[model samples]
Target: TVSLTEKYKEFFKIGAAVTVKDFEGIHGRILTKHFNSLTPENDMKFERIHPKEDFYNFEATDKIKDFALKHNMQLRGHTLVWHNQTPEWVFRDNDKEAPKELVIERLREHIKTICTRYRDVVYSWDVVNAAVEDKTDVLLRDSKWRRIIGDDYIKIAFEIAKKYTGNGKLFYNDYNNEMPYKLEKTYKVLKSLLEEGTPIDGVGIQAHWNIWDKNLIDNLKRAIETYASLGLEIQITELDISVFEFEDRRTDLLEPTEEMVELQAKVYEDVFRVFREYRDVITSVTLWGISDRHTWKDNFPVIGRKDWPLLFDIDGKPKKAFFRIIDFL
Candidate 1:
């Protein structure tokens, strides 16, 4: 059978978010077999890569980059700037909020250092992440970056990225882009950046979903159209569907039921359908992780929930959803 990457080669790259642990286990074998692109799930984030103001950690990131290069996989920088998981020192001086001028200066240094180091290999970056707020009236989400530097942090981050990377795709990544209210806010934010001539290349829609959401397909279609209308390309940055119900999201059922697999397969089909249909605007579709065993959904938005998400089962076998999605391709 053709691998997942080969199946989507004509459409867009099929990718998975991976970790250092994946490199030496069954995870590595599956990743090499199925994915043509790779996103370091947390290794490339600000906190992991640059935990201290003057300290830089490239150990894990280097491993990931080397692995991608060895396998001929496209490498994407997970993020250069974000709210959560960012070190406090980035916006703090003497235990107080750093002044606006200092914060802006710090941002420039961070972007230049990271982008310049990986400019040759990393082809794209999540320049600003989750900056748009859910609130209707706000221009940006409340974060140290916004609180210290105001909304200009978005523009500054992108500008520095372009300066260093020299035409590498700069992406604004966020979740809930399918919801009308959040989508409007995200669109307005990106539109403003584009109008000001920011070197923004694309938008990352983190398609985290539930298996039973009836509005999944329509909402996805609307999001693709809206972003494409702005002349921005779209990448399904972190795609996954939870098989458990929301109210019962915390329940852990290690055993997979036929019903769950069937429902998840349908959801995956709907997602891949939109991805293929929007091939012009869509450059890649990346699952958040390779398999159900290590999915972030189990611990995200809530803790202690055993969630089954992703294309492969816990044992590294492709699920029904995998075949269903291939049929679409």
Candidate 2:
């Protein structure tokens, strides 16, 4: 097999988000052949890693670390601060929001511990994820952290991460960040953070798009140009193209139509075209998952929905999108 990293070594790294299962069998083979960089799909998230306030689970992360070490693969830690997937105890005591001091204390402990423990293995961290809101006129999400710690929560998290990360890079990650308004809001937040010496090293675009719209590539290109202007490295941290748009989403388990697959390949082709042209600043591009059978899109937006949103099909065979992009290069 012609490995993806081998083909694109001169350009940039090829990456994917992997669970523990991805380190074995055919999944392992595909990863070894196709990618050189990795992000944890869900294993490194706050809840999974530090489920309780005191106890920490190193089961999956340790396996991922050993696997990456044995294979000599690069690991980009998924996230340290997110509004979701965090245990309630982190922000609450006696069922009410904790005080600013307590919340900040917990936040610092969490980021510090993860950065220090994973510093040697993972080279970068998504220090804060999706702090920007999607709604019009709202710059930031009214998350519990935001409500309790004020807007400076992002700065605090990044600072702790930077302190313990050693030489590792720190990034603020978000989804739908390509939308014009969202882009502006995210840009402002990142710009101010940088100006304040927040130690932000890059931005992570969670490129989870659907196979619709004629302007997908245009918006993405502009986003790359916009983020690059901040002089921050850009990483496509969670790349996946759903077959269904929100308006057209369904809950049934029907196999995707050929037309849908073809549309997806077209978008992948166009998106990669932009990625190739901006290899200098776009340092890494990682798919959200390894294959269609294992993708989160199947249950998201609408539960039980079968979404073919990855480079490989349900059976782990390479799809048209895989050949489409690689063949072009």
Candidate 3:
């Protein structure tokens, strides 16, 4: 009865699988264990490696994907190119000059190979992620890719992703797409891509937001409707919120405070209402991480500042956020 996926089967239509540890807590695992469609969040990102040339292995990533495939989960690649979380080597060049061409080539190769390598398994990809700046609500100024390839680099990435993906959805994903200025930029770019004959197949709204903000959900749906106007399939990728009011640095983890848990549930309910409403256009909705245990929120922008931005707690117990989303969906 507590399985969010099963409880909301009619509304959500599909569920994403996270790290193996996620299901182990809160008895929700038993429910999700049977739900076949799953997506590994961190398995396909750049930081999956460490500081070295092939020295940093992909053992952790391999195991995660292997488990997902063995269980018949629908895998979604988190990202291919990003301004953050990329290796320093990616920015390096032989001389002081920017390796703009090389960077573009490498980006193409990364997207092509990653998609091709997992061609048979993964269903969708967040091809170009977080390209917009939150404050300016503009495509990030001085993004390495933008600097190298100009604005057309986005089309190039989508082009490469399409080569490998073939039938799979090729998407441009980002967070904070709900704001008017940001949404305006998103709408403009997506429209340009469509009009110019860019091969983008979908758009991924990383709908991570404030825990109790209902207006935020309204804005997000509005943004999605605008994108759908461009005939792009929608995926609510990286959906999570910091429900816990405070960060417990002593534990180096975020535990949900009493007030925040209620807030988190309310947020989930509002978003899921929109999710159910657009289930036809929306393809998948993925939580950012398995649980608060392994969320990237801890060191995001600044390290060691913890935040409870997930559906489950460290022990894998479902807070009200889980029930709220499940019940609503």
Candidate 4:
């Protein structure tokens, strides 16, 4: 069988959001055999890497770095700044809300340390993730990062990252970018920042869609064209097509029906068909998890219900969706 990355080697790198455990046993074999780019899922996030302002955890991330090096995989840094997955102390000053200057200083130190240390290893970095707000009126999410450092916090982070990250491309990553509100907000914010020379190199489109959304392909193409017009490289940063639509409010972990599996397979294949048309702007595509054996979707949003959201199934074998994608290529 042709490996997934092999088919796309001339086009763009095929990547997966992975963990250290993904390097062991059967999951490891499938991962190494098919993918050539890595994003070390949660380990590279702020909370995991630098939970304490004074302390840093290099154990897990270090292991992932070594594994990627051994495999000759190009690594994409998950993030440098984000509202979620970060400790409270980063936004707190002696139990009170951190002042703007204090918060800005912290952001500078954090990016300087992480980006410089891994600059040689990382080929790209999500400089800031999910900064735009869902509300149409609100430009950026009112996260503590913004509450303390102000709206231009994203620009400042990207500037700091540009100083320390060597040649690694800096990206602004976000989800639901195919939606009108998200697309407009993200483009406006990034465009204003880029006009001021904020040093953003790309946009990380988190292509998290579902089987039921008929507007997906068109919406995605629109986003790609809009972002590409800014002269930014694009990456399908966290791509996954969930089996259930967001409105499917089921609590039970029912196995996906055969029809649902086929639906998902068609969605996967068709989604990549659109991806194929824009190979010039799309530098990489990363699935959120290696397989359905384990996924954060098992308890997300409202929790309880499970989501089959990757190319491999529960048994670590390639699902029909996987074959549809690779075979089509």
Q: Rate the local accuracy (lDDT) of all candidates.
A: 0.86, 0.87, 0.69, 0.88
Number of residue pairs clashing in candidate 1, backbone atoms closer than 3 angstroms, sequence gap of 3 or more or interchain: 0
Superposition TM-score, candidate 4 onto the true structure: 0.97
| Candidate 4 lDDT by residue in tens digits, 1-329 | 78899998987899999889999988799878999999988998999999999998889888888988898888899888888999998888896888999988998999888887788889889989999887657888889988888888988898889999887999999999878778987898888998998999999998888898999988989999999999999999899888778777787756888888999999999889888889999999999888888787877765766788999888888899888888653
Query: Candidate 3's residue-wise lDDT over 1-329, tens digit each?
Result: 55555565554435454665654555235325434455666656765643333445456656656766765566777777777777766656755645668777666666665676666767787788877666764556567667877888788887778888866778889887877788888888888888988888888888767675556866987887898889999988877776432233343444556777677777777778888888878877777776676777677644777677777677667767777766641
Clashing pairs in 1: none
Model 1 per-residue lDDT tens digits across residues 8-73: 888988888988898878899988888988899998888888899889999998888889889998
lDDT of 2 by residue, 1-329 (tens): 67778877887788999998998888999998899888988889999999989989988998888888888887998888889998888888887769999998888888888777888988779989989988858888999988899989999988888878887889999998988888889999999999998989999999999888777888888899999999899998999999888777666647888899899998888888888998899888899998998898888887777889999998889898988788754
Worst 10-residue lDDT window for candidate 1 reads 243-252
All candidates' TM-scores? 0.96, 0.97, 0.84, 0.97
TM-score of candidate 1 relative to the true fold = 0.96
RMSD of every prediction = 1.5, 1.3, 3.6, 1.2
